[PDB]
């Protein structure tokens, strides 16, 4: 299957500073990459789909982008409610998620 | 509003089986496939399999091929995953999600903790 | 044909009509057995005519362009003569349901001067009528044979005259001095090699048929002379 | 006139309350559609386009209890336009790239109702059917071109194909006078192909065509041999004739390239050496060696020599003869 | 009389049915799930920058107007019902001149499941535009696209989708390949939005990854080019006093090199 | 499905008693028809046949009071087969030799009714149009190929043409990538051609094509220079 | 009635290429009714025949 | 410029051989055959423009 690898295993960016999370796919996945936020003791929450489109009801700070095999989720100004593990997955084939990336201050 | 409610916390000894349910609400249950996801403590989400509720066609992850069997009931808008030959490695929290498109999983389950010991 | 349903008594002797009424009445399903592709004419309107008499006679004529299939046998080419047919019959109605027959005026062949027949000359026409048996029944078939006689005037200037003239170029090798080794070979190799091109382009005019034709025979013999002429100097030196 | 009136009521009765949308015995056992072909001609086998054009009287028969009549004791053949008011199989040819039914003076089509209900339905069809050809042994090659007759919308649970007459279904194959080929054999097969949408019935009409080598011998091989034969006359020319032998050798080797290039243009852009190619390339080596034979002679003299001409006058005819024997035995047999 | 039960069902479905209005008009977007089965990947015409492809173009959508209850759960029908109901107006953005085969009958199938779902496949021969950058010709590879979508309905009206995983939705027949001088390495798919004068439209893109096979050009241009270069170098081994012989060597090869250069370009645009 | 029934009644009223034989404002002022092209591609620019092949999305926009509705707030995109039940302008390309509307998966047309009565009518057309080329300076030549959109049966007293958006009516010209031509310029004109049958509106879309000489050095000049 | 139509008629022009390429031809274009004889349909030029 | 000039230049070209010394046989022979073969191609190529 396609393995998704998130380069920053953890992030310690301070509150209010731009933080970028990366997500690498071993092979082509088109634009079928989605980003999910999982706060502790919570189910995943869809944030970005299509590798660029923002799910309805999500704050506008989140902005994903990326060509095939190179996908990034950039938070322009991380706030006190964006601290959680972030999951990137692909649905171009049988769905495989990436290792969660955790944020800290 | 949509809501995927699941069975709840479980405890079980190795060797015996277990069944977990995922109750759909708010949308036409047969329109969208239901996916099952596994998440061990502090580990990446793993896809088990999905079932087409309309005709109950199932596709399984090769790792979980045989370990899990997916069944659905049209009458009660519920999806069931049955696990057999449980071991320590099978202790995790299991989620159910609906694939709204071929782009994203729209609504996820509450999460069903499982413990084998 | 006669159609008792379409009989009317009045002062009018004939109802002369356009293509509009053709689809309303029964028309025989005549098709051409050897037509690779045919089409009617539709500009400005469908080139069809229909006339109905009192007794029930129906006259139905239409203009057709038929790309018929004539199985040429070019064993002797370009002197071949062919008898190209044009068969037709009802596609569905067997001999017990549709019988055809040539009228007294068999085929009113038009003025042959304006025809696009350049290669051939229209010698004459011949008609027949016979019953062909098939899996779906016995059908009456009527075939028109057109006899076409080839003219070789173009092929002489196109093929033979170049083939004749090039062979003469070999002969002048002999009058050229034997000591001129490059000159003789120059003429010989140039003469034979262009003979190869003439054979191919001459052979190109023919289709891909697996048998030597009369045109092929002429070029091959001309090939022997040019080759022998070159070989004549080879032994001469 | 009683039959004309009686036949009119019968045919009018059948088409009244007839649903073209439902097949015979809809929601029931599959309808068995018998097929029967009569090849009128095989116009042209094209290697460039990898297809052949075939004209046939495609006929297919099936049963329809709705179209069963018994008042009149005869088989009703009706206008071809009635076919638009009756259910007919949705037969299609999976290979066809461009096909049509002839339409002069009327649509070349047939309908014939029988009292039991059997519907005899025939079409005159010209099909340009795809046939991918393995030209590795070309022109000593043998092609197997097929025609894949299949139902599109109806699975094996709704329709069923068979050759009406186990081996007498297809006729006319013997008389077909194909110029380039000779139809060695023809086989009639029935299968069941499975797609993601279901299982469908298949009939295959194969034609094992064999190349007529005669056309190419006069056109391709004979020029190559004579070009190769005349290459050797350089060996009988005096060694001190550089202007002559070089002109001869250069003339011959260039001609082989033109023949090879000219020949390959007529064929498709096929990325492998065919039997013809392995002969033209083989002949190229001999003529080129003959050119190098003189260059070897010239260098040894200016830069004994008569012996090289003599041995080359014997070796070259022989080793080329063996090249023919090994070539023709490998390919012709 | 046995079929009269099914005839009354079809009459009921089409009673008061308006095939001019898409399902869920003014209420919902029309989701069209589509997949392609390539029965053969036709030849590539680099001269015209195009390729041919024969497909079973399957597309499925939900139409609540076509729900029914009866002895059968699926109504397996013919092309006639296709024209009676609403079907999507899909078209190929880079298509040049495609054929909807209708021999012997319109090569289409229409199946109505009892829940209103429709399966509507059709056999097509699409001749599509493949822009080629021939900078590395003949050692070049191309990703020929096959884009399609609705002609009239914007993203807010009909949205397209792959019926299976996007990787698993374009399937090529194992024995279906009419390529001569190319290899079908594989295909990739994607979906996006395209702006136009009329509005935003969903475009379903498939890229067939081709790679030319240089076997032909090796033995048509390179080998003649290599040998004529060898021919010109035979002159170096001839005595310098053979002026006519070495001169014919030079002119003949130069002229041969000229015709090869002119001949080589004739294949491509 | 309540809104579907409402739309059905509205769309049914418009075509009820709709005389397809009569243009909008028949017996009244001319109907103004707005056009805007989207050049999909230009191919087969052939001087042997003196023509070029043009693929485009040819949209026409005009007002038809008979097709005005107010109940529905949204614009109705209807199945393309409705166009056969509606009056549409009889526009033809005068220099067109051979044209067709693309046919798969269906007829490549669009009908979109707007509440005020406006009708957006689009076609995807591949037209082989005649372009007479002055080859005197060939291959270092600039050709001027045109497309002559004109109404056949309706004179200027019955119909008018205008480029909808003016100079922004035609798009895609920059993207078009001809192999041996550079599309240096394109222009849009509005004429009134007079025939013996009356005066008719005319829209002319001219592209000035400049030939690329790089190909001809490889095959034409350098071989002759080296010889 | 005025009934006009746009056509691309491909008419036959028999040529005598005796003086080719210094040859001139008078290519005809003949038309008339297919079904109506001279006693039923007659054709005429709308203006002077020259114009 | 397609047929008459190539014919006129070939015949003018063939008459260049009259000014070449008689002792140069290969030069004048290749003058001859090359012009005749040139003429043959012109004849065949001239007909293809006509039926
Ligand atoms: C698969 O799809 C193809 C399309 O790709 C279908 O082919 C089309 O079929 C329809 C229906 O049969 C044809 O329409 C008919 O056309 C008649 C004249 O067509 C001429 O012009 C067209 C261009 O417009 C050409 O394409 C035609 O040439 C082609 O077809 C002929 C065979 O028809 C071949 O021989 C050629 O080689 C070409 O391939 C023609 O040149 C037209 O007259 C006809 O309309 C009359 O009949 C209908 C029947 O109901 C009436 O409603 C109508 O009013 C007309 O009737 C008047 O005229 C007749 C003439 O005698 C009178 O008898 C009547 O009384 C009345 O006065 C009809 O419109 C269409 O041309 C054809 N080709 C296309 C669309 O390209 C296949 O059928 C389809 N199925 C299969 C199995 O292949
Ligand atoms: C309407 O159309 C039908 C069918 O086309 C006609 O019925 C045919 O009539 C002919 C005339 O007699 C029959 O000819 C012979 O019939 C024999 C009877 O075979 C029956 O038994 C089995 C059924 O299991 C089948 O063979 C067949 O379908 C019949 O049901 C056949 O055995 C004969 O076979 C061979 O005969 C000679 C042998 O040399 C050959 O020339 C033949 O080609 C064939 O190989 C022969 O067929 C024919 O069988 C009838 N067919 C059917 C289906 O009934 C009606 O007569 C016709 N009505 C009219 C014209 O009014
Ligand atoms: C041109 O090239 C094609 C290649 O595609 C050849 O096609 C194959 O030809 C062979 C030889 O005739 C066929 O072999 C046959 O296989 C059948 C088994 O497969 C079918 O089985 C059932 C029917 O029973 C179908 O429903 C099912 O879908 C399968 O398709 C056999 O039943 C056939 O009969 C013989 O079977 C055994 C031998 O296996 C014998 O013991 C029997 O007595 C009987 O003789 C036969 O074996 C094959 O099916 C063809 N299609 C393919 C491979 O796709 C053409 O033959 C060739 N033609 C020419 C003229 O060259
Ligand atoms: C049914 O269809 C109608 C017709 O399209 C839709 O209504 C139009 O929607 C378009 C959307 O493309 C709107 O277009 C915008 O109009 C703005 C205002 O234009 C006014 O002035 C023009 C002058 O000719 C009038 O024709 C027009 O009617 C308006 O009165 C323009 O300012 C816009 O251009 C601007 O775009 C961006 C963002 O504003 C700027 O950065 C640019 O610089 C530029 O200034 C644009 O053209 C238009 O308002 C609507 N009315 C029309 C065209 O008459 C309906 O929405 C649709 N129904 C639906 C979707 O339910
Ligand atoms: C020149 O260009 C013009 C462009 O206008 C073309 O003319 C159109 O051609 C199409 C195709 O033939 C015509 O479409 C036809 O419409 C008929 C009428 O439809 C109305 O009435 C029926 C009931 O009679 C209603 O059911 C329907 O909803 C409409 O209200 C149809 O009856 C025709 O059906 C035919 O085709 C179908 C295809 O599935 C068959 O199943 C049928 O049996 C039947 O054969 C057909 O759909 C259209 O009407 C023409 N005019 C216009 C203005 O569009 C010319 O074809 C084109 N070529 C020439 C030579 O002129
Ligand atoms: C390919 O070749 C064609 C030629 O057939 C070119 O098309 C012609 O282009 C010219 C110039 O664009 C057109 O000529 C005129 O253009 C005017 C544009 O306005 C300018 O000129 C006016 C008057 O001189 C100035 O007042 C103004 O400020 C601008 O400087 C049009 O307005 C003209 O129409 C008016 O005048 C004519 C003649 O007097 C009247 O009959 C009209 O009613 C109107 O009042 C005029 O069009 C010419 O019309 C074009 N078509 C032709 C000649 O058929 C293409 O341009 C060329 N391709 C490219 C890419 O350039
Ligand atoms: C004038 C008449 C000549 C005849 C004379 C007889 C003798 C000549 C004999 C001729 C017969 C041999 C030629 C057959 C060609 C087919 C095989 C082939 O192409 O090989 C491979 C080419 O693909 C590669 O692997 C790249 C290698 C390119 C090599 C270029 C030639 C050598 C250049 C050095 C020479 C210059 C140095 C010389 C300096 C002194 C296979 O590729 P493919 O099949 O095309 O398909 C693509 C790959 N695929 C298979 C994985 C899909
Ligand atoms: C085309 O076919 C027709 C039909 O066969 C040919 O006309 C028919 O020719 C026969 C033979 O001559 C006629 O029968 C003969 O009539 C003469 C004169 O009455 C009589 O003396 C003979 O004993 C014999 O009966 C037949 O009548 C005639 N057809 C008609 C309708 O009268 C015609 O010759 C054929 N065209 C050719 C061969 O070019
Ligand atoms: C020694 C000798 O007799 C000379 C006479 C002709 C010479 C060959 C000509 C063609 C050459 C092509 C390339 O230049 C490589 C060397 C090459 C093969 C040469 C080999 C040596 C030869 C045989
Ligand atoms: C038609 O009328 C004529 C005389 O007017 C008569 O002789 C003939 O019998 C009539 N035919 C009929 C009524 O069929
Ligand atoms: C191009 C033709 C070469 C010469 C053909 C020789 C084969 C014999 C032909 C004559 C047989 C009757
Ligand atoms: C891959 C096939 C190679 C073809 C080689 C042609 C030359 C072999 C014959 C040489 C005879 C001396
Ligand atoms: C360079 C090619 C030379 C080919 C020589 C073949 C004839 C036999 C050689 C005998 C040498 C004494
Ligand atoms: C089956 C046809 C094979 C005929 C082969 C003839 C060519 C032999 C040439 C031998 C010349 C030495
Ligand atoms: C292409 C693989 C088969 C090669 C056939 C070799 C036999 C032909 C003669 C070669 C000369 C020895
Ligand atoms: C063996 C081919 C002919 C070469 C000339 C022979 C002269 C005696
Ligand atoms: C019937 C086959 C004849 C082949 C031609 C003769 C040999 C060149
Ligand atoms: C089928 C054999 C054709 C004739 C062969 C000629 C051999 C030189
Ligand atoms: C691949 C084998 C090639 C042999 C050719 C002979 C030497 C030029
Ligand atoms: C290929 C020929 C090599 C032998 C030449 C003689 C030694 C210089
Ligand atoms: C056709 C080849 C002739 C071989 C002659 C060998 C004796 C010098
Ligand atoms: C794939 C190798 C082709 C042969 C190269 C030719 C060298 C003289
Ligand atoms: C009008 C063309 C005249 C040129 C003739 C050629 C004279 C050498």
Numbering used by the authors:
A (entry chain L): 1 to 105
B (entry chain H): 1 to 52, 52A, 53 to 82, 82A, 82B, 82C, 83 to 100, 100A, ...
C (entry chain D): 82 to 318
D (entry chain E): 6 to 308, 459 to 488
E (entry chain A): 9 to 277
F (entry chain B): 6 to 232
G (entry chain C): 126 to 176
H (entry chain C): 227 to 277
The authors write:
Type A γ-aminobutyric acid receptors (GABAARs) are the principal inhibitory receptors in the brain and the target of a wide range of clinical agents, including anaesthetics, sedatives, hypnotics and antidepressants.
In the APG/GABA dataset, 3D reconstructions at resolutions of 2.5 Å, 2.6 Å and 2.6 Å were achieved for the two-Fab, ortho-one-Fab and meta-one-Fab assemblies, respectively. In particular, the side chains of the 9′-Leu residues, which are crucial for channel gating, are rotated out of the pore in the presence of APG. Specifically, global TMD alignment reveals a concerted, approximately 2° (between 1.5° and 2.5°) anticlockwise rotation of individual ECDs compared to the APG-free structure when viewed from the extracellular side. The greater TMD tilt in our APG-bound structure creates five intersubunit pockets near the centre of the plane of the membrane.
